[PDB]
Amino acid sequence: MEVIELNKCTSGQSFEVILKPPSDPSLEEIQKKLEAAEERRKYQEAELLKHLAE
Amino acid sequence: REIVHIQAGQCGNQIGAKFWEVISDEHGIDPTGSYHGDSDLQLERINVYYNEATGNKYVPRAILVDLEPGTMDSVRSGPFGQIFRPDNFVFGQSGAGNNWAKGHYTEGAELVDSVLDVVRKESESCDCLQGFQLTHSLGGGTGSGMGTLLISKIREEYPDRIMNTFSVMPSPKVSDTVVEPYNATLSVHQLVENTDETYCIDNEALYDICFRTLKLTTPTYGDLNHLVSATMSGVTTCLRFPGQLNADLRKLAVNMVPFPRLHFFMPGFAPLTSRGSQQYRALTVPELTQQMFDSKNMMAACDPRHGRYLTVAAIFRGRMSMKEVDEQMLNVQNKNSSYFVEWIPNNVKTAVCDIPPRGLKMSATFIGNSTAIQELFKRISEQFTAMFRRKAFLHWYTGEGMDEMEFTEAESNMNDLVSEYQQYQDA
Amino acid sequence: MRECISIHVGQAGVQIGNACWELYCLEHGIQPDGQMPSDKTIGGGDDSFNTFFSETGAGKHVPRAVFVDLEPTVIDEVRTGTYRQLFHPEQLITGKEDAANNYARGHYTIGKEIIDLVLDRIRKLADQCTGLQGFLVFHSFGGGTGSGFTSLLMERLSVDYGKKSKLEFSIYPAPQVSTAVVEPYNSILTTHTTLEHSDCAFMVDNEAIYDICRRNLDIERPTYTNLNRLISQIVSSITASLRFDGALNVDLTEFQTNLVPYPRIHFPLATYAPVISAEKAYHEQLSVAEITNACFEPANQMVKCDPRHGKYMACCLLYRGDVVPKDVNAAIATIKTKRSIQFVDWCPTGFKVGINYQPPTVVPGGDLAKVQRAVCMLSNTTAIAEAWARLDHKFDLMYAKRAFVHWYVGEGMEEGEFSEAREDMAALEKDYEEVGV
Amino acid sequence: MYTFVVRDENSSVYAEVSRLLLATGQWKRLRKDNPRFNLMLGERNRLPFGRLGHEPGLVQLVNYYRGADKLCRKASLVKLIKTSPELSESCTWFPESYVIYPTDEREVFLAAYNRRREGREGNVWIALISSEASELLDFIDEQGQVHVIQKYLEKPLLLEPGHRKFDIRSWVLVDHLYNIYLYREGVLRTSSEPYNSANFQDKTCHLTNHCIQKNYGRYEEGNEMFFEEFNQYLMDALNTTLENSILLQIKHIIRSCLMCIEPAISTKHLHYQSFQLFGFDFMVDEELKVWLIEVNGAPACAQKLYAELCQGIVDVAISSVFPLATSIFIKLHH
Numbered sequence A: 001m002e003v004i005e006l007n008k009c010t011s012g013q014s015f016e017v018i019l020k021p022p023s024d025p026s027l028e029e030i031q032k033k034l035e036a037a038e039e040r041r042k043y044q045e046a047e048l049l050k051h052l053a054e
Numbered sequence B: 001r002e003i004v005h006i007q008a009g010q011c012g013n014q015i016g017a018k019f020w021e022v023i024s025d026e027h028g029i030d031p032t033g034s035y036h037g038d039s040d041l042q043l044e045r046i047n048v049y050y051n052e053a054t055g056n057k058y059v060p061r062a063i064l065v066d067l068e069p070g071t072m073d074s075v076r077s078g079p080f081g082q083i084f085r086p087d088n089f090v091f092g093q094s095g096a097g098n099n100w101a102k103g104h105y106t107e108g109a110e111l112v113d114s115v116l117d118v119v120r121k122e123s124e125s126c127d128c129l130q131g132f133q134l135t136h137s138l139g140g141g142t143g144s145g146m147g148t149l150l151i152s153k154i155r156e157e158y159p160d161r162i163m164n165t166f167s168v169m170p171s172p173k174v175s176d177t178v179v180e181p182y183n184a185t186l187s188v189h190q191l192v193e194n195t196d197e198t199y200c201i202d203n204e205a206l207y208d209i210c211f212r213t214l215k216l217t218t219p220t221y222g223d224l225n226h227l228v229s230a231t232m233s234g235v236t237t238c239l240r241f242p243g244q245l246n247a248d249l250r251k252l253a254v255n256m257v258p259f260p261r262l263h264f265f266m267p268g269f270a271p272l273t274s275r276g277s278q279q280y281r282a283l284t285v286p287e288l289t290q291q292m293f294d295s296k297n298m299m300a301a302c303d304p305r306h307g308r309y310l311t312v313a314a315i316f317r318g319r320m321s322m323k324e325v326d327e328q329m330l331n332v333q334n335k336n337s338s339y340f341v342e343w344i345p346n347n348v349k350t351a352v353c354d355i356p357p358r359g360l361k362m363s364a365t366f367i368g369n370s371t372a373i374q375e376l377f378k379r380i381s382e383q384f385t386a387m388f389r390r391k392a393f394l395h396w397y398t399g400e401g402m403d404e405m406e407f408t409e410a411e412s413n414m415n416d417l418v419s420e421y422q423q424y425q426d427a
Numbered sequence C: 001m002r003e004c005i006s007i008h009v010g011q012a013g014v015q016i017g018n019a020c021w022e023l024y025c026l027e028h029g030i031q032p033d034g035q036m037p038s039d040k041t042i043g044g045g046d047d048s049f050n051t052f053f054s055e056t057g058a059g060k061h062v063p064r065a066v067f068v069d070l071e072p073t074v075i076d077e078v079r080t081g082t083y084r085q086l087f088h089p090e091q092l093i094t095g096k097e098d099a100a101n102n103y104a105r106g107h108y109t110i111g112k113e114i115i116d117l118v119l120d121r122i123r124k125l126a127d128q129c130t131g132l133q134g135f136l137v138f139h140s141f142g143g144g145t146g147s148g149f150t151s152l153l154m155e156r157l158s159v160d161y162g163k164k165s166k167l168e169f170s171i172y173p174a175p176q177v178s179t180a181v182v183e184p185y186n187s188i189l190t191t192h193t194t195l196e197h198s199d200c201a202f203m204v205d206n207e208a209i210y211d212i213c214r215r216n217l218d219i220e221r222p223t224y225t226n227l228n229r230l231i232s233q234i235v236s237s238i239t240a241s242l243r244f245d246g247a248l249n250v251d252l253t254e255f256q257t258n259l260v261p262y263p264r265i266h267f268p269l270a271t272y273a274p275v276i277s278a279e280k281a282y283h284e285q286l287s288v289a290e291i292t293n294a295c296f297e298p299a300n301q302m303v304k305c306d307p308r309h310g311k312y313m314a315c316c317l318l319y320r321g322d323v324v325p326k327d328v329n330a331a332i333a334t335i336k337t338k339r340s341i342q343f344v345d346w347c348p349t350g351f352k353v354g355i356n357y358q359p360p361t362v363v364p365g366g367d368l369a370k371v372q373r374a375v376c377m378l379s380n381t382t383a384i385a386e387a388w389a390r391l392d393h394k395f396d397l398m399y400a401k402r403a404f405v406h407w408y409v410g411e412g413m414e415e416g417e418f419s420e421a422r423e424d425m426a427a428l429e430k431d432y433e434e435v436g437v
Numbered sequence D: 001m002y003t004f005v006v007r008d009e010n011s012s013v014y015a016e017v018s019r020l021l022l023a024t025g026q027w028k029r030l031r032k033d034n035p036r037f038n039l040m041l042g043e044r045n046r047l048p049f050g051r052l053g054h055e056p057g058l059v060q061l062v063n064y065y066r067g068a069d070k071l072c073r074k075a076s077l078v079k080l081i082k083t084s085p086e087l088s089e090s091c092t093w094f095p096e097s098y099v100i101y102p103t104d105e106r107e108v109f110l111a112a113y114n115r116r117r118e119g120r121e122g123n124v125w126i127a128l129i130s131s132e133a134s135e136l137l138d139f140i141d142e143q144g145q146v147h148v149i150q151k152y153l154e155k156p157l158l159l160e161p162g163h164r165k166f167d168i169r170s171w172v173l174v175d176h177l178y179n180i181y182l183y184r185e186g187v188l189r190t191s192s193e194p195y196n197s198a199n200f201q202d203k204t205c206h207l208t209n210h211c212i213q214k215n216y217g218r219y220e221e222g223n224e225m226f227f228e229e230f231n232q233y234l235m236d237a238l239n240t241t242l243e244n245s246i247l248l249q250i251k252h253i254i255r256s257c258l259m260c261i262e263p264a265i266s267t268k269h270l271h272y273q274s275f276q277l278f279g280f281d282f283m284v285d286e287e288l289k290v291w292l293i294e295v296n297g298a299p300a301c302a303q304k305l306y307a308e309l310c311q312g313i314v315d316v317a318i319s320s321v322f323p324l325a326t327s328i329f330i331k332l333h334h
């Protein structure tokens, strides 16, 4: 019913119609997560080469 | 993404040679190593298997291994024998006498370093090596014993690369010696640990297919190898031609292997055809879909109705309605949903390639990770236990330095593999 | 004028980027070589299109975009594509080996050795800006790169560009075009890690796009090209307000203000109409009332769900073509009495409307037919949570057996991150429940 | 070969449906958590509608309408009836009711309670049955959950011989096309003990539930009079039929209730389709004026009518979508 904020221009026009009213981690921590996971890869690869060495 | 091919032993080199023969024709490469095709689809991903030389010469990235020069000399005189890089011919003289111990511990250990020097020379040329693929039997000594030794040493030097294998399983129906169950069990133990992907090619199945289906009264190793080369070409299609699904060895493993030890695949193929005998009638898509799933078409002597499919990879080849493929593929899963585990949603993945194989207007290759594969390993275990309970024919191995405990361990680990496959069959 | 940088991650992100920027160039009259005859301010300016394009003294108008993929085959087709002259090498980043459909491989393993390079190449674009609004990130949920590397990038951008807004254009996984079985894993993982770092995300279920192409364009087996050219039309409708003169959604902050009252619930549902086949011999042009009524048909949504059994928090109507406020208000009045449109009690029941007189552009040789008037509705409905439910169910099925988990743990990831990610999704489904019922 | 699942074991109705389906040899039952189904006989609570219609290559169907609880819940039905313009403030066929929350429209309820008292007319209500508003409000707050207060029909039609009370149960089936099918065989769940006008404390002759009654089995077998007998009774005792005096009102109330919520639950253009069996409970006063009492979203059938009805469901609701290799319903047209 109620049209408001009607703005017009050459390109077009915009407006709002209301029908009814109502009723972060740091760079440190990131680098710590990535490197920690890198160690877990290194440990896993080391255990493999240790196992293969046997 | 380059793949380094290796073929070990009599069987490995004979199917390996047949493999390079088949796909070389598909990629329009002649025995001279020159391209003479009509489509650019053939050369887009030809670098995966072929090294390019000056004058546009394509040389297989293949390494031929054997502890005796007998079979490898036959390859070099064979049809495409000249295409192979001569320096990649690495061989001994003693042979392994169908002895796993000889191939893995004594005779083969003497030769393995020479092989790894060739592997290293190829790998250094690779822009981005994705992994290796091996062709060998598990019933012999070289391909089984030395093959698994190579795999172990390749993993040590390339632990972040994929290891694939085409492993031919032994069978009494097609038997060279009585000690094949021993060599096989010892090899499975190695494959469970040091491979990401293994295509189980049962000689029992290849025989039954040639006998029962293809009506060949007395099939030879040549008849058996017609099926292998057909399957080998199919399962590598997605790797050799431009595609979205399972284009590389790793992505295939991620989609096919829910658990690291359970990576032994049942290959299937349709239409089944014998050598020479040309078929004139092209199969409909419903026929390809029905056949490729039938037990009579599996390359591994296992009943897929006795287990459940963890994952499945299918590849239709030729010119067809991809819509009809999607329909028929969905029809199988919906008709027989019980034979697909419910705890892996959408575990079936289909692909299509325009280029069909030679002789056929269209075909379909099946790759299934079924729990029913245990029937294969159980069969080997029974034949193993039958001899081992009396320690029969064991002196061939202890004479090479092996202990009885190592057999007991190999036996136990394969029985574990069986039980693990059984675990997910009743989940 | 404030600039916007577009980041395209993974195959899906790159190829969709190609479709969008292709469409942008045709809408603004920019040629493949980058020359824009209509732009009379040579060597620079601060027009509305400059939000997406910078300018060189030579008169070339280059996209403010970066393309990243851990595998070169896709972006290489951009380097040699028809718009190869449009970008420059420093905008196109490629790795050696992909993430192999593995989130952990794209985030932790391979993601670690290129994150610094990408940020530097992004910083080079940011330095060329006078007033950076923020970023528009295009990626997939299923891919290892689209899921893994995006979440890592979205984390670092929040650190390097804390004040800047970040919008998402995400491709929700669909079996009919799926490339991996573990895409549900990758989807939950990247959502959890990106959630706090995303201001507004437009999800597009390939399932929905796939059936629209089959149903309305009569394409039996839609290719990515068929999907992408349709998606680009939706994206264009959303970003048109940033590239054209207007007074609705003129900057990134307004997208969040208008569509996202609650931060975590920042997944507006998009509905587009009409989609018409170019090969359709005879077509009757649809009216404002008809296309507007189509915005409430599930068959036209980017995600298949049922808004009737949920609640709205916001609702925007973006028109392109012969449309005037009078017809829209009449259409809204009619539809309101016919359909079930329930807003949350703490929100006004209304519609923010935007109209551009220029009708939607179509790619020559494309599958879409030129239309006299089209519309894209952006509605923040709790019904979109059905997609989260579908996705989390598949996640529970596989994870109960720990299937494929070893692939992720093998890349240094912890099995705890699976349950942590799933717990965050469980909370999200609850948030949607509290608001929705 | 179609496929289906069962997720409600307590369903006496669909236990028979599942039996009939398997007996055709063209339907296969799967496990509960098998997503590759054509039909789903879902649960009564937390039925995952959001996971339906997302299986490529499968036309899926479910035996429940999402959002149909707005009609099958007492607190919701009152709201629906009072808010919906199609049903309005005061439709003649629904008793005057109010929604009351334990410590809303309590003040509104008392406003009407005064007119009845300051008019010296019938002033009895039901949640327990009483004529004092204070006795009722103290009962609702003592229970815990939300209840509905409703005008008690003080002048109900009474069956003779016996001077008894009764309620009619009609079974309605709405298919995927939203065709409203009324089952021709209904049932009168009668009271065996004579209706007492004064003493409301005795709820054995006021409440006509099949469980409470179980004088059980005196007049008819199991306190269940079918239409052939009830019709014959009307003709002999009142010189009218069942069709005219009652059924037209029933067909009207059913047609009205479902048309009201059609746009809110219809699965016409959805990715999955729905059907559902409803059980409407009506009430007749001495002037042969039918009153709607409530709607049951998960109704049980009568032992005699199980076979015929359960088969009926398969034909028009299931076999219509999934065809295989005169009618018992009345199509309420609209």
Ligand SMILES: Nc1nc2c(ncn2[C@@H]2O[C@H](COP(=O)(O)OP(=O)(O)OP(=O)(O)O)[C@@H](O)[C@H]2O)c(=O)[nH]1
Binding pocket: C009, C010, C011, C012, C013, C015, C016, C069, C070, C071, C098, C099, C100, C101, C102, C106, C140, C141, C142, C143, C144, C145, C146, C147, C171, C173, C174, C177, C178, C179, C180, C183, C206, C224, C225, C227, C228, C231
């Ligand atoms: N709509 C649309 N979806 C795509 C497109 N390309 C890929 N996808 C979807 O993206 C999902 C997989 O993500 P990808 O983008 O292919 O993978 P990626 O981002 O390159 O990451 P990697 O695994 O490292 O290759 C699949 O489910 C596809 O359906 C595309 O061009 N358009």
Ligand SMILES: Nc1ncnc2c1ncn2[C@@H]1O[C@H](COP(=O)(O)OP(=O)(O)CP(=O)(O)O)[C@@H](O)[C@H]1O
Binding pocket: D095, D126, D150, D151, D152, D153, D166, D167, D206, D207, D208, D209, D281, D283, D293, D294, D296
């Ligand atoms: N407003 C009213 N006036 C007169 N009698 C009424 C009434 N409301 C209910 N009754 C009587 O009370 C009985 C049971 O009430 P209701 O039917 O509301 O409970 P229920 O919902 O537990 C039964 P079902 O299991 O069939 O759904 C009715 O069959 C009817 O005989």
Ligand SMILES: Nc1nc2c(ncn2[C@@H]2O[C@H](COP(=O)(O)OP(=O)(O)O)[C@@H](O)[C@H]2O)c(=O)[nH]1
Binding pocket: B008, B009, B010, B011, B012, B014, B015, B096, B097, B098, B137, B138, B139, B140, B141, B142, B143, B144, B168, B169, B170, B171, B174, B175, B176, B180, B203, B221, B222, B224, B225, B228
């Ligand atoms: N399919 C096939 N199997 C073979 C062939 N040759 C040998 N085998 C199998 O391999 C086993 C013998 O191993 P073999 O290859 O001869 O040992 P190796 O040469 O020392 O490695 C037996 O179980 C055979 O069934 C062949 O040409 N084709």
Ligand SMILES: [Ca+2]
Binding pocket: C039, C040, C041, C042, C043, C044, C045, C046, C047, C055
């Ligand atoms: Ca300018």
Ligand SMILES: [Mg+2]
Binding pocket: B010, B140, B176
């Ligand atoms: Mg031999």
Ligand SMILES: [Mg+2]
Binding pocket: C010, C011, C071, C098, C143, C145
């Ligand atoms: Mg990729």
